[PDB]
Amino acid sequence: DRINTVRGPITISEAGFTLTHEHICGSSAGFLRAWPEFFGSRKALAEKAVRGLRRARAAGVRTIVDVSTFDLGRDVSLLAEVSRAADVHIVAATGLWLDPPLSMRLRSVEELTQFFLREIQYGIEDTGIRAGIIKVATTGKVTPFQELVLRAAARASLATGVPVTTHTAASQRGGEQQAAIFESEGLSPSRVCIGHSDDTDDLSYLTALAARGYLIGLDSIPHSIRSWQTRALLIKALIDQGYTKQILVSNDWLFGISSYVTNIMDVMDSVNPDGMAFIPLRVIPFLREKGIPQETLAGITVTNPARFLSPTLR
Amino acid sequence: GDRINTVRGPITISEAGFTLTHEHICGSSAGFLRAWPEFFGSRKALAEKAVRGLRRARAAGVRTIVDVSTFDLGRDVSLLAEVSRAADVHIVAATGLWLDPPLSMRLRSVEELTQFFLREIQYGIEDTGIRAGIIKVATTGKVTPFQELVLRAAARASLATGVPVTTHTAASQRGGEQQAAIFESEGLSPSRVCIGHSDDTDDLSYLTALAARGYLIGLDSIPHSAIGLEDNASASALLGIRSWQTRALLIKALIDQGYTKQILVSNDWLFGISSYVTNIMDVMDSVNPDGMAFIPLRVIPFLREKGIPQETLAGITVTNPARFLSPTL
Numbered sequence: 001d002r003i004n005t006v007r008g009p010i011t012i013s014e015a016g017f018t019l020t021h022e023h024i025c026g027s028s029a030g031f032l033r034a035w036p037e038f039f040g041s042r043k044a045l046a047e048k049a050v051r052g053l054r055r056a057r058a059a060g061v062r063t064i065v066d067v068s069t070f071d072l073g074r075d076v077s078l079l080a081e082v083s084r085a086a087d088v089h090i091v092a093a094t095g096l097w098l099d100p101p102l103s104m105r106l107r108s109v110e111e112l113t114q115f116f117l118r119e120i121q122y123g124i125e126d127t128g129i130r131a132g133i134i135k136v137a138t139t140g141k142v143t144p145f146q147e148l149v150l151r152a153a154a155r156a157s158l159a160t161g162v163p164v165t166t167h168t169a170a171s172q173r174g175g176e177q178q179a180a181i182f183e184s185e186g187l188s189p190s191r192v193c194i195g196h197s198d199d200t201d202d203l204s205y206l207t208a209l210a211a212r213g214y215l216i217g218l219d220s221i222p223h224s225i226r227s228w229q230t231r232a233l234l235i236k237a238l239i240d241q242g243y244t245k246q247i248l249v250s251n252d253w254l255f256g257i258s259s260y261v262t263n264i265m266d267v268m269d270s271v272n273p274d275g276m277a278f279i280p281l282r283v284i285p286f287l288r289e290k291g292i293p294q295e296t297l298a299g300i301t302v303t304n305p306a307r308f309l310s311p312t313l314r
Numbered sequence: 315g316d317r318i319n320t321v322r323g324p325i326t327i328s329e330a331g332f333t334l335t336h337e338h339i340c341g342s343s344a345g346f347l348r349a350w351p352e353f354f355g356s357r358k359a360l361a362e363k364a365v366r367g368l369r370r371a372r373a374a375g376v377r378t379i380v381d382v383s384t385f386d387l388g389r390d391v392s393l394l395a396e397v398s399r400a401a402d403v404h405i406v407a408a409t410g411l412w413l414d415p416p417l418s419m420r421l422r423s424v425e426e427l428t429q430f431f432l433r434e435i436q437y438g439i440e441d442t443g444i445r446a447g448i449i450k451v452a453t454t455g456k457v458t459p460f461q462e463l464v465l466r467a468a469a470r471a472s473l474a475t476g477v478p479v480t481t482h483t484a485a486s487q488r489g490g491e492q493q494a495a496i497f498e499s500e501g502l503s504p505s506r507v508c509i510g511h512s513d514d515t516d517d518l519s520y521l522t523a524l525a526a527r528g529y530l531i532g533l534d535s536i537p538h539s540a541i542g543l544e545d546n547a548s549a550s551a552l553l554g555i556r557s558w559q560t561r562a563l564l565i566k567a568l569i570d571q572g573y574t575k576q577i578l579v580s581n582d583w584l585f586g587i588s589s590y591v592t593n594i595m596d597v598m599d600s601v602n603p604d605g606m607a608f609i610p611l612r613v614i615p616f617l618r619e620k621g622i623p624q625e626t627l628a629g630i631t632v633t634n635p636a637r638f639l640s641p642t643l
């Protein structure tokens with residue numbers, strides 16, 4: 001019924017057109033606070049994000065899910081500020097990505113479950129802002145620590161109804177091992193989005209996951225040696241197979257980046273000047289031109305994220 | 315010249331008094347104390363514990379500690395300021411990087427890292443206005459490419475500000491020699507550098523050779539010992555199984571070799587720890603219930619009894635830290 005955002009709870013019907021995998025800033029824990037000049041300034045980064053969210057809004061977007069975890073340097077205070085100024089809802093994430101510090105890597109599954117629960121049930125830091133999604137990430141065949149993270153994420157999800165969303169290497173079919181771990185925990189696939197799934201041409205891998213009830217996160221379409229149109233046709237391919245209700249689409253864009261080489265943000269913006277508006281301005285019309293009907297597109301961009309984000313244990 | 319940055323502002327170096335040069339309020343990770351304070355019970359619980367412990371150290375004669383927690387050890391300078399003020403003990407904060415840099419640090423150039431260290435020294439840490447008075451760096455065995463960048467940025471920051479450098483070593487690996495070589499290649503004076511965790515080894519040839527070059531020698535983990543705890547693999551790995559007396563004897567050894575002016579002594583204690591196994595703080599607190607008061611209450615009398623003059627012990631615990639911390643270029 002209600003989804004937590006960085007400005008408080010909203011009803012399902014208020015979410016509207018939702019981008020389910022995005023970032024205000026891709027960074028590291030404490031980094032934005034310790035070295036804001038890395039981004040010019042905190043004000044400059046905020047202003048860029050407000051402009052970018054208002055552009056997304058004018059292209060029809062009403063909500064984004066920021067899947068920046070603790071170790072991606074999530075600053076929910078920043079998220080709240082730019083959400084307010086852009087009038088775009090932002091759902092914040094708990095979980096762990098691929099750069100956990102020692103204080104996280106040395107935790108038990110039980111400890112990590114408490115941490116994820118605290119961010120969902122109590123709030124993030126001292127802000128009272130509660131996470132509405134759990135983000136996790138794996139590499140290869142899943143490390144021992146990543147297995148603990150996935151199990152902790154399943155248990156937090158099962159306690160709260162909040163969904164899980166993942167980082168994979170699609171070229172390694174990494175969703176398969178993630179699914180196996182989630183199902184061993186008793187998690188329903190309909191609570192899970194297997195993400196970065198547009199980085200493959202292996203349709204049979206995606207269909208098999210969709211048939212098992214997973215949400216398929218076709219979430220990095222503008223990250224272009226495959227063209228974006230090729231990635232976008234995976235959306236059409238899953239629709240054509242009758243799995244429209246399993247599709248989630250996004251840009252995986254960011255407004256600031258420090259967890260990579262300096263000035264990569266500049267390179268990225270020059271390649272995709274549309275930013276988070278790439279899905280609604282380029283991918284949706286491309287799909288219309290391929291004959292996908294309005295009702296289907298609305299299903300994918302409004303109905304599917306609402307069903308996914310609404311906390312549910314059914 | 316004669317003023318040093320503390321988390322309550324600049325003090326003249328005559329106000330530093332008895333100084334523990336390698337300590338921690340909390341051993342953690344960037345962002346961690348603010349995201350998960352319940353890991354330590356609560357933030358208030360941790361602050362209260364630190365204040366009790368610092369007040370006891372103060373009763374025992376300690377006037378200043380140097381908290382050598384960096385960004386990636388989860389340094390929260392607001393917490394340092396809160397507990398410094400309440401215990402009325404000076405705390406010097408650190409910039410630099412330890413052994414757990416996140417990607418956003420690991421991918422930076424030497425010039426970027428230099429700017430980051432200079433920001434924390436010359437401008438302030440985060441938005442607090444509190445300036446670091448020391449640069450902490452760390453290496454393991456062979457220095458990694460990234461650690462080499464960190465050590466060069468530290469040297470450059472020190473040369474620009476006069477602020478000293480203090481290091482983490484694996485002393486069993488004679489790590490200070492690789493560190494010293496890099497520092498000297500940048501033109502850094504050894505008198506601006508403390509080679510830390512040097513009490514982790516009994517190799518007096520290694521220690522005296524560094525001392526002879528003008529390095530400060532950090533004998534900084536004296537109460538660290540898992541003797542009696544040999545069935546505890548994690549505590550043994552961290553604390554070692556050499557006795558505190560064995561560690562303390564290195565202080566007398568370096569004095570006896572003529573290097574009194576090169577010795578810095580500390581506990582390397584902490585009031586909270588998240589960057590290791592859960593329960594390690596409780597284990598440590600049972601090994602050493604004196605906490606940071608261990609140096610003045612145990613080690614100083616031990617050395618006296620060996621016949622070391624009071625004046626020598628006062629030079630080590632007061633004069634050497636003052637000379638080390640006073641910005642000098």
Ligand SMILES: C[As](C)(=O)[O-]
Pocket residue numbers: 026167252
């Ligand atoms: C921060 As990412 C490139 O895993 O979406």
Ligand SMILES: C[As](C)(=O)[O-]
Pocket residue numbers: 341387482582
């Ligand atoms: C935080 As330590 C054990 O390197 O002093």
Ligand SMILES: [Zn+2]
Pocket residue numbers: 137166167168196
């Ligand atoms: Zn990812």
Ligand SMILES: [Zn+2]
Pocket residue numbers: 021022023067252
């Ligand atoms: Zn992402």
Ligand SMILES: [Zn+2]
Pocket residue numbers: 481482483511
């Ligand atoms: Zn150390």
Ligand SMILES: [Zn+2]
Pocket residue numbers: 336337338382582
């Ligand atoms: Zn230390």
